[PDB]
């Protein structure tokens, strides 16, 4: 009686283990659906909704703004995030000039 039941109880533990793998595999496609975002620093403020941000490659463009960002932190001297398609500001990231960690961290032991 308990021989067939114990075999299914062990499979039930494997079912819950596959449930975490289902979402983990589906999140892989969800992570690949995202696109790239350009990172640049604000140089000069042209207008309220018009900013001049220097791309990391060295060209500059006039980019717009969205409703998900605050224009108070979009001023000059602050690194922001641009768009690779319409060339507009998308999100806001903390300021890091050239994030080389091996130079910043000393590997203390």
């Amino acid at each position: 009686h308990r021989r067939y039941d114990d075999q299914l109880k062990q499979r039930r533990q494997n079912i819950r283990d596959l449930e975490k793998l289902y979402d983990k595999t589906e999140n892989d496609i969800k992570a690949l659906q995202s696109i790239g975002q350009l990172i640049g620093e604000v140089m000069k403020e042209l207008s309220e909704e018009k900013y001049i941000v220097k791309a990391s490659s060295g060209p500059r463009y006039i980019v717009g703004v969205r409703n998900s960002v605050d224009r108070s932190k979009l001023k000059k001297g602050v690194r922001v995030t641009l768009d690779i398609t319409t060339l507009t500001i998308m999100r806001i990231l903390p300021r890091e000039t050239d994030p080389l960690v091996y130079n910043m961290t000393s590997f203390e032991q």
Binding site: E26, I29, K30, L32, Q33, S34, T86
Partner: protein, 157 residues
């Protein structure tokens, strides 16, 4: 409260399949919407219809197949993975027991509160051919969120 933003592509696409099915006034079309309901502003970037059948003499008669909904969600993961089911829409001016009872059916596959939509086929009065309605568990009442029409730069022009 929350806010609703629906692109003009979603509104007119819902009206097309209404006439393509030769749906008269005795029948109404029900469909689902996609977008991001997590933020305070609900955005609808996509919509899909459903084979909804209803009796005109009985408001307790409706036909809703979740297998087409389960398949539709699997077909959208290969197109746009950032979109999830935020609710469902329906056609016709009238609200009867068919559309009221199915609001809990879509709740199983929708994490947020399903956003009810009445799509006016004749566009009678003012603007906003479609109204965004939300329901509360605490008594139930249909409240309309500040639905707005906004799209991207290439979609508006």
């Amino acid at each position: 409260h929350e806010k609703v933003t629906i692109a003009p592509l979603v509104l007119l696409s819902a009206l097309d399949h209404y006439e393509r099915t030769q749906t008269k006034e005795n029948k109404r079309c029900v469909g689902v919407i996609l977008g991001d309901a997590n933020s305070s502003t609900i955005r609808v970037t996509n919509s899909f219809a459903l084979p909804f059948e209803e009796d005109e003499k009985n408001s307790d008669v409706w036909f809703l197949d979740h297998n087409y909904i389960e398949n539709m969600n699997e077909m959208c993961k290969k197109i746009n993975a950032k979109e999830k089911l935020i609710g469902w829409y329906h056609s016709g001016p009238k609200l009867r027991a068919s559309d009221l009872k199915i609001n809990e059916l879509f709740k199983k596959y929708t994490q947020n509160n399903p956003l009810l939509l009445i799509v006016d086929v004749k566009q009678q009065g003012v603007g906003l051919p479609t109204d965004a309605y939300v329901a509360i568990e605490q008594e139930k009442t249909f409240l309309h969120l500040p639905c707005t029409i906004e799209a991207e730069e290439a979609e508006e022009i």
